[PDB]
Amino acid sequence: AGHRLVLVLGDLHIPHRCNSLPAKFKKLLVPGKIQHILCTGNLCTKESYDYLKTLAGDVHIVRGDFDENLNYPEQKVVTVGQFKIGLIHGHQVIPWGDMASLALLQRQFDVDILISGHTHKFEAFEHENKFYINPGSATGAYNALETNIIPSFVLMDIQASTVVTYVYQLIGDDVKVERIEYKK
Amino acid sequence: VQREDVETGLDPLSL
Ligand SMILES: C[As](C)(=O)[O-]
């Protein structure tokens, strides 16, 4: 082994917008493979937290603007391997998903990787030796500004000073997988 | 940024 597998996901909006994750996603996410879970928020209820605890015994969640649990922290900074990682739902970032506001957050937090959600749009890019991840929405839940949403989630394989970011997407009725490498 | 596709069954969740 020796790799740290980190699941990244959020904006499920269960059950108000969606009842479950895609069946094909549930087949991939099985106990005993993932070390840590970093959740951007908007679960939105304890049942989804409970489900995440069956997948890994180290679960991190930040508070979304539709989360029921107001005890979640607003943002969180964690260290996995050599990487310092920052986590924010993103509805605080003004305007929605502006690259300038996110870069501001990165310097404020002093992280190698900045994870955020709220736009329900997967992105993963490198900007000034800094890495930015949006997992999208793992259920394909609509939001304001967008209704035709591709369900997705991110898997980070952290080893030494490389992060290998897998992106999983339900396109049509099948899972498509891409990978992006980021160096520290 | 450098988005390479990944062959069937080569992602961590499948072997
Ligand atoms: C609804 As809030 C305090 O997480 O921006």
Residue numbers in the entry:
A (entry chain A): 2 to 185
B (entry chain B): 1192 to 1206
What does the primary publication say about this deposited structure?
Endosomal retrieval and recycling of integral cargo proteins is essential for cell and organism development and homeostasis and is orchestrated through a specialised endosomal nanodomain, the retrieval sub-domain. Combining X-ray crystallography and in silico predictions with biochemical and cellular analysis, we reveal that Retromer directly associates and recruits the RAB10 regulators DENND4A, DENND4C, TBC1D1, and TBC1D4, and the RAB35 regulator TBC1D13 to regulate retrieval sub-domain function. In addition to its scaffolding roles in associating with cargo adaptors for the sequence-dependent recognition of cargo proteins and the WASH complex for aiding retrieval sub-domain organisation, Retromer should therefore also be viewed as a major endosomal hub for controlling the activation status and switching of specific RAB GTPases. The retrieval sub-domain therefore constitutes a hub for integrating cargo recycling with the regulated switching of selected RAB GTPases.
The three DENND4 homologues in humans, DENND4A, 4B and 4 C, all have similar domain structures consisting of an amino-terminal MABP domain (MVB12-associated β-prism domain), DENN domain (consisting of the three structural modules uDENN, cDENN and dDENN), a long extended unstructured linker sequence, and a carboxy-terminal domain that has a mixed α/β globular structure of unknown function. Searches using Foldseek105 suggest that it is a unique structure found only in the DENND4 family members. Both DENND4A and DENND4C are predicted to interact with Retromer using identical mechanisms, and we discuss DENND4C for simplicity. AlphaFold2 modelling predicts that a conserved PL motif (1203PL1204) associates with the Leu152 containing hydrophobic cavity of VPS29. We determined the crystal structure of VPS29 in complex with the DENND4C 1203PL1204-containing peptide which completely validated the mode of association. Furthermore, the crystal structure confirmed the prediction that DENND4C engages VPS29 through both the core PL motif as well as an extended upstream sequence that forms a β-strand extension to the VPS29 structure. ITC analysis of a PL-containing synthetic peptide from DENND4C established direct binding to recombinant VPS29 with an affinity (Kd) of 15.4 μM, that was blocked by mutation of the PL motif or by the addition of a competing VPS29-binding macrocyclic peptide RT-D1. While the observed binding of DENND4C to VPS29 is consistent with previous related crystal structures, a second binding site is also predicted between a short DENND4C α-helical stretch (residues 1232–1243) with α-helices towards the amino-termini of VPS35. Consistent with this AlphaFold2 model, immuno-isolation of VPS35-GFP showed association with endogenous DENND4C that was partially reduced upon mutation of residue Ile218 at the amino-termini of VPS35.
